[PDB]
Amino acid sequence: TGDERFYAEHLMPTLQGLLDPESAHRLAVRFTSLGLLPRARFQDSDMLEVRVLGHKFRNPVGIAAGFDKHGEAVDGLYKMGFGFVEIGSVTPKPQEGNPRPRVFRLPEDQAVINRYGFNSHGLSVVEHRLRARQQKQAKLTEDGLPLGVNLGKNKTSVDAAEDYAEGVRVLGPLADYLVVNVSSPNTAGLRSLQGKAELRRLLTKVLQERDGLRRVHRPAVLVKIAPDLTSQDKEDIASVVKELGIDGLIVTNTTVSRPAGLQGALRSETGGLSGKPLRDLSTQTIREMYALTQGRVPIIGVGGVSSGQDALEKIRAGASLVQLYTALTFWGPPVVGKVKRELEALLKEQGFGGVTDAIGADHR
């Protein structure tokens, strides 16, 4: 399309030339929340529908956590053509996150590095925001457009599992799925929650809290993992997820690694790296986790998706659904329909009747 070129060649480079990335993000959140978006001309075909996590998803392409941290732009993101929206991470108490600057573009790499540190309006503020559109969301959910809520921990929390439990109690009843984010690289100690003994204790407490919610308000619970895990850590996660009946995995968060070859001047900033250089590390992590779980645990695949091919690679490796964030920085809103159109094309070329038939196809 005309819109795809204009955004990619003119609008987004202009925005980047005028605004630091934090400012640009805030402007984007505001524009999205007001629906000031190009026409999403693409119409989701039936071949893109997926049923997973107790829900229908109109298309498998979602917005990854971090773009709408505080649940301000949900409706605008469905307008953009996402099949599902995930907000957060949300922490129990409000907190400012790290000092500025804390996000960095690597345009030569089609990558970003961030160290926001869980800036968050907190559970109460987000609860009230979601409550104001709760039945609008119920209708969307029924129509195949579900909502996820991603939960974090405050910086000075003295009991991580209690922070997560509080999130389950407060936002659980407003979500179609919850995400226990134990993979931010930007909160000290947080990734150690991925260890076997810590995850089992943490997850058992999360699941108990969830199961105490009334049936119509009881979300699926997913765990979001890092791309930097050891083999032992992956095996341990898979074991715990099976043991406890965790509903799904989100694979992956940003990487603390710096793959060889990065060109951006800002490559050595501290934080998590996203976008193109994370792509195949994330696809590989999906593949491994799918195998370790016997294909029985739904996976949301994320990291470096900016085309239909990238989405199909993750689906074929084991993802039921995919998410993207960093591709918007570079391509803007038209990227969404681009992914979807390309994905539909490739599915037909590869002889799949729909997305569902492609899930895990590389393992067979």
Ligand SMILES: Cc1cc2nc3c(=O)[nH]c(=O)nc-3n(C[C@H](O)[C@H](O)[C@H](O)COP(=O)(O)O)c2cc1C
């Ligand atoms: C600026 C920024 C902020 C993020 N904040 C969060 C977050 O609060 N919670 C979370 O689970 N992931 C967070 N993420 C990670 C993304 O959800 C996603 O896992 C990652 O960026 C890989 O996808 P991408 O390459 O399409 O950006 C963030 C990513 C970026 C770029």
Ligand SMILES: COC(=O)/C(CN)=C1\SCC(=O)N1c1ccc(Br)cc1
């Ligand atoms: C001055 O800023 C704009 O014109 C923007 C952007 N943030 C526009 S114009 C139409 C549009 O879609 N956006 C936009 C919205 C979300 C995102 Br993500 C990127 C750009």
Ligand SMILES: O=C(O)c1cc(=O)[nH]c(=O)[nH]1
């Ligand atoms: O720093 C953050 O808030 C954030 C960054 C990120 O890359 N991942 C995440 O889970 N949190």
